[PDB]
Each structure stands twice: as C-alpha cells, then as structure tokens.
Design a protein around this ligand. Sequence first.
Ligand code: FES
Ligand SMILES: [Mg+2]
Ligand SMILES: [Mg+2]
Ligand SMILES: [Mg+2]
Length: 156
Amino acid sequence: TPEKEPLKPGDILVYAQGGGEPKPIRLEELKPGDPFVLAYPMDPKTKVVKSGEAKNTLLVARFDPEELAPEVAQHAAEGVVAYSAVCTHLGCIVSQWVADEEAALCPCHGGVYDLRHGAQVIAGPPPRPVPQLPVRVEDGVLVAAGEFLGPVGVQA
Ligand code: FES
Ligand SMILES: [Mg+2]
Ligand SMILES: [Mg+2]
Ligand SMILES: [Mg+2]
C-alpha cells in the first residue's frame, strides 16, 4: 500500500499524526536542545504519509551545529538531525528523551542512543546505532536528503 511504501529521498518530514491533515516539520519550530519529535516521511506530491510502515518512523532533533560530531554534521541541516526511531535491539520505537544526555531512550530494554554523536549506543542492548537519515531544508521545511545511512531496525 502507498502508506507502507519506504521512505524516499525528497520526502517531506511530518510530525507523527493520527488522522487529519499532516503537519510538515519546519526548521523554525525546532528549538536547539529541545527533546526530539517522532516523524514520518510524506510523499511530496501525493501527500501520502508513509506511516503504515514502522521502519519509516523517525526521530528528529535540533542541536547547536557545533555540538554535533563532524560525521553527524555532514548529514545535518542547520543543526537538525534525524535518525530511524526503530530500536536495533528488538524493534521497539525509541520514544523517550534523556535530558541530561541529549539521548534517545528505548523503553523496552533501556537502549540509549547518543544523538549528537551519531546515536552511539551508550546504554542497553542495541547492537548498533540507529542509522542517521540525511536531511535538508527546503522553503523552511525538513526533507529527507538521502537514504538511511545503514539498515533499519532488527537485523541478523
Ligand atoms: S527493543 Fe530497544 S532496547 Fe530492546
Ligand atoms: Mg512555533
Ligand atoms: Mg561532543
Ligand atoms: Mg530498566
């Protein structure tokens, strides 16, 4: 189904939504240092949000660009970073924030990913970082700028 299609470069990032019209994520809405938001990709011409496929679930956060690791900054936009939100341990959505680590926490078994430093696993059983999603800003809206930088979710 269109709603289960994979994320594609050029897709518009929208806030995770129930029904109703989607809301694109605008750069100016994200305050550097604030907790991440959960997002999905939306096909820019059909406006179909690809939220029926869990492996399209994203977390999106903004930091001061100087606080990002250079490798992360390569794929960031005005300090905004995005990653897959599917835990690489057993696939739970990495839905919680760790304020004093600026990290994403998985409530299932306590995986913690260090968002400014490439979602390095700093606690729990995730075997590898959630992959980064390159982003760019177009007319103030966040857009996927490439494929995920590695496989999503639970792998061999
Ligand atoms: S599914 Fe995330 S830590 Fe186990
Ligand atoms: Mg605002
Ligand atoms: Mg650092
Ligand atoms: Mg625990």
